[PDB]
Amino acid sequence: VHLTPEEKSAVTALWGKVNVDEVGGEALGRLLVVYPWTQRFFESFGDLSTPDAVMGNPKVKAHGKKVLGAFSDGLAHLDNLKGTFATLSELHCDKLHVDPENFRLLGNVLVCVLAHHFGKEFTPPVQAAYQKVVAGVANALAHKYH
Amino acid sequence: VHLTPEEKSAVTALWGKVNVDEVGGEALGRLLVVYPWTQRFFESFGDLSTPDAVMGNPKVKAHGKKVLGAFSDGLAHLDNLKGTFATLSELHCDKLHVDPENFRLLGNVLVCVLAHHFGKEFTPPVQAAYQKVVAGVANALAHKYH
Amino acid sequence: VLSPADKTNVKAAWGKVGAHAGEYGAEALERMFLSFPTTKTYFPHFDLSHGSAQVKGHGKKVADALTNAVAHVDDMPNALSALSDLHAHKLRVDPVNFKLLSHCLLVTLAAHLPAEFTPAVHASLDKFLASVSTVLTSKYR
Amino acid sequence: VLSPADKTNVKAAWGKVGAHAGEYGAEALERMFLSFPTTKTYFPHFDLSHGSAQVKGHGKKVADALTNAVAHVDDMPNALSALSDLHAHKLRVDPVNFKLLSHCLLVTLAAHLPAEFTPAVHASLDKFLASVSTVLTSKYR
Ligand code: HEM
Ligand code: HEM
Ligand code: HEM
Ligand code: HEM
Ligand SMILES: O=C(O)CCOc1ccc(-c2ncc[nH]2)cc1Cl
């Protein structure tokens, strides 16, 4: 019901090449620039007023690191995404009140960042694998909402 | 998609009062009126020039009848929906080429129709149940796509 | 775009809700919160209990804003100008949620105005709600 | 709505794409077909494997229309009107699909524009593709 055996390998291989801190910071930064309404959740983060400032904001970088770190961990359990993110799913619903649509926007921004950073190497079939993954993670994060 | 027991009970109770043929042709009719692009598969149905003509068209009614007929029949298996709809899924992908979004438009039209039809009896909790059903059926119908 | 027929159908169907503005808006909101739980993430500061004064109040504010838009159907960007400002820069509700509320408003109207809710009016009201949502999200970025 | 910076960003980015627009278009389609298989339903008559000439030819028409849209980023609705009719009244591609292809165009651009694809340009391209999408569906109903 999610992610073929072979697509798992493209995921694993590309991710071995990823500086998670770098990517996480870049992807959260872009979410907030490209879809500025997502800023509603980071009022305490400081200067978010322009693209520069968002990308250079240390709290955005910090958090992007945390978020994508959790994403990274989940890649080790591609066959049990719901169970893996159930704790964070309820946190995001009960404590943080984050519309799960945001996980889908971030997924698409991350896909763009992978593509921008890896270039030719982010091939159509590798993108396909990662689309399934981000969809799966978003779905898993949305799963305990009520 | 994880309907509680009272939700399933609500679904069936309400459906027990449904004239499938009539609601079938009402819903597919309204789909073709409300989302005219859905007409693309039915250029062999005759007249679709007006709301009245579309609602009146017997081939529309006929297909409406056949489709809500299969939907109706699938309601007996709210347990595993994607199982019961697997084969119809394959068919709609390989032969019919129906964008699964079409199932989602039809699900919301069906809900509107149940509302218009049952009025007051279509309480918000009864609606919440039917939303899960129509989403479930659409996911099931899309699941075999490739 | 709304056609003149569209504008005729909307004015007719909505003038019909009339005084039930507040009742229908609140019902629509409740249908939404129940059918589409993710939408509650925007109202953690409301008592979302059936019958809550908070939801009843908001329902009326939603209906009234819709009454306004119908009243200025030719000129909706301007008539809703402050509301789109509010949603763009402060509330910041993700655009996907407007389709969910719009849907519940359609369902509410269908359950209350069976005589008025013809296929043609159903289509016009769907386009109308969509155009309101578009106006309300036009300033997001 | 597309701001002056948006238009500047798009023209720059698309200007850098230059002669590869055609190639980038087929790539974007390829990306879409694999990432979102439901989109294949609109192309039952195509060989959709990698390298396909049908895919390459269509990709070039898509890109060309986008180039032309850029050249008229002031009057997009008319420049694209023919395509609107076509999509609205014959192709009848469900609106949800425009977001999938737009996303794949974005990804294709990101993968070919290491320097140009800044956050601000990314933001502008996404807005731009959304506007094109809006225009292409503006006649559906
Ligand atoms: C893959 C998707 C996501 C994952 C895996 C994820 C994971 C996490 C984690 C692990 C934390 C804990 C931070 C810590 O340990 O200090 C966190 C906090 C948080 N997340 Fe998510 N997140 C995701 C997406 C999002 C999105 C898209 C948003 C909003 C648009 C969001 C909003 C927040 C907020 C507001 C916090 C609290 C920040 C604070 O402490 O002030 N998350 N998330
Ligand atoms: C709950 C939703 C639906 C159900 C349960 C359903 C079920 C069915 C069934 C049982 C058939 C007959 C299969 C056969 O003849 O072997 C069928 C055929 C077909 N369906 Fe679907 N369907 C649904 C939605 C849709 C929608 C929304 C569309 C288009 C907008 C569509 C397009 C078609 C077409 C074009 C055929 C072939 C008709 C013919 O050959 O005469 N279906 N479907
Ligand atoms: C037809 C679509 C919509 C209309 C016509 C509408 C209209 C309004 C109006 C009139 C207000 C109150 C403004 C004031 O206090 O002066 C408001 C506020 C608000 N809206 Fe929207 N809205 C719509 C869609 C949405 C959606 C889809 C959501 C979330 C799912 C949402 C969330 C909110 C929230 C959280 C507030 C502030 C509520 C409060 O604190 O009292 N709105 N809207
Ligand atoms: C940026 C968005 C899009 C642009 C600019 C665009 C542009 C075009 C162009 C230039 C053509 C050729 C028309 C001609 O012959 O003059 C075309 C045709 C077509 N488009 Fe679109 N298009 C877009 C989105 C889509 C999407 C999302 C789909 C479906 C997923 C789609 C499905 C088709 C199909 C099936 C054809 C004709 C294929 C054939 O020749 O058999 N288009 N489009
Ligand atoms: O994301 C959505 O569903 C729509 C809301 O956000 C936008 C998304 C795209 C655009 C845009 N900018 C230029 C053309 N279209 C404008 C807005 Cl306000």
CA-based nearest residue to C129, from C4, C14, C38: C14
What residue numbers of B does the annotated binding site for (2R)-2,3-bisphosphoglycerate cover? 1-2, 82, 143
**D30 — phi, psi (to 5°)?**
-60, -45
The whole-angstrom separation of Cα D33 and Cα B112 is 33
- Residue range(s) defining the domain that contains residue D103: 1-141
Residue type for position C33:
F
A54 near A32, Cβ under 8 Å? yes
Domain count for chain B: 1
State the total domains in chain D: 1
Q: How far is CA C119 from the centre of its chain?
A: 19
> Where residue D77 sits, what CATH number does that domain have?
1.10.490.10
Report whether A141 contacts A103 (CB < 8 A).
Answer: yes
Of C38, C44, C94, the CB nearest to A37: C94
Residue type, B72: S
Instruction: Identify the DSSP state of D139.
Output: T
Residues 101-120 of B with CB under 8 A from C: 108, 111-113, 115-116, 118-120
Q: List CB contacts of D19: < 8 A, sequence separation 6 or more.
A: none
CA distance linking residue A90 with residue C24, whole number of Å: 31
**Would you call D37 an interface residue with chain B, using a CB distance cutoff of 8 Å?**
yes
> With a 6 A CB cut-off, is D140 part of the ligand 4 pocket?
no
For residues B106 and B103, give the distance between their C-alpha atoms in angstroms, rounded to a whole number: 5
Q: For ligand 4, is residue D24 a contact (CB within 6 Å)?
A: no
Place of tokens 């898993």: A140
Whether B68 and B75 have beta carbons less than 8 Å apart is answered as no
Among A4, A109, A22, residue whose Cα is nearest residue A64: A22
Q: What is the chain A residue with the closest CA to C35?
A: A146
Cα B111–chain centre separation? 9
B54 residue type, one letter? V
Range of the domain at B54: 1-146
Q: What distance in Å separates the CA atoms of residue B3 and residue B132, rounded to the nearest whole number? A: 7
Search chain A and give the residue with CA nearest D31. A124
Q: What experiment produced this structure?
A: X-ray
Element (H, E) at A118: helix A101-118
Cα angle vertex C136, ends A33, D121, to 5°?
Answer: 25
Closest CA to D140 of B50, C9, B37, B100: B37
CA D75 remoteness from chain centre: 17
8 Å CB contact between D86 and D93? no
CATH of the domain at A111: 1.10.490.10
CA distances from A55 to A31, A43, A50, C23, C42 (A): 10, 15, 9, 46, 27
Pick from D47, D10, D50: nearest CA to D31: D50
CA distance D60 to C100: 37
Residue bearing tokens 């192709």: D91
Q: Which residue of B has its CA nearest to D42?
A: B97
Distance CA C115, CA A62 (A): 57
Q: What is the CA radius of gyration of chain B?
A: 15
Beta carbons of A28 and A60 less than 8 angstroms apart: yes
What phi-psi label fits residue A119: left (phi over 0), alpha (psi between -120 and 50 degrees) or beta?
A: left
Q: At what angle do helices D4-17 and D21-35 cross, to 10 degrees?
A: 100
CA distances from C56 to A84, B128, C28, C102, D56 (A): 39, 20, 10, 17, 56
Rounded to an integer, what distance in angstroms lies between the CA atom of residue D80 and that of residue D84?
6
CA A89–ligand 1 middle distance (angstroms): 10
| CA of A142 relative to ligand 1 center, distance in Å | 13
SS3 C47: coil
Q: Is the CB of C21 under 6 A from ligand 3?
A: no
Q: Is B88 in the pocket of ligand 2 (CB under 6 A)?
A: yes
**DSSP assignment of chain B, as one string?**
----HHHHHHHHHHHTT--HHHHHHHHHHHHHHHSGGGGGG-TTS---SSHHHHHH-HHHHHHHHHHHHHHHHHGGG-SSHHHHHHHHHHHHHHTT---THHHHHHHHHHHHHHHHHHGGGS-HHHHHHHHHHHHHHHHHHHTT--
Exposed (0-12), middle (13-18) or buried (19+): which is D47, by Cβ within 10 Å?
A: exposed
The one-letter amino acid code at B88 reads L
- Cβ pair B48, B42 in contact under 8 A: yes
Over the range C65-83, which residues count as b (16 or more CB within 10 Å of their CB) and which as e?
Answer: bbbebbeebeebeebbeeb
SS3 A26: helix
What are the backbone angles phi and psi of residue A35, rounded to the nearest 5°? -130, 70
**Angle, alpha carbons B72-B74-B78 (nearest 5°):** 120
For D58-71, the DSSP string reads HHHHHHHHHHHHHH
Residue C110: name the closest of D124, A121, B109 by CA: B109
Token digits of residue B18: 């449904």
Sign (positive or negative) of CA dihedral C51, C57, C61, C64:
positive
Q: What's this structure's resolution in Å?
A: 2.2
Q: How far apart are CA A69 and CA D125, in angstroms?
A: 28
Distance CA A12, CA A76 (A): 9
CA distance linking residue D26 with residue D62, whole number of Å: 8
Stated as kind and residue range, the H or E segment containing D122 is: helix D119-137
CA separation, residue C66 to residues C24, C62, C73, C128, C134 (Å) = 11, 6, 10, 10, 13
Cβ contact A139:A78 at 8 Å: no
**Residue in B35, B37, B99 closest to D41 by CB:** B99
Indicate yes or no: CB of C97 within 8 angstroms of CB of A99: yes
Residue D140 DSSP class: -
**Taking the alpha carbons of A43, A44, A47, A52 in that order, is the dihedral positive or negative?**
negative
Cα–Cα dist D28/D129, whole Å:
13
Residue at B131: amino acid letter: Q
Cα distance between residue A146 and residue C36, in whole Å: 9
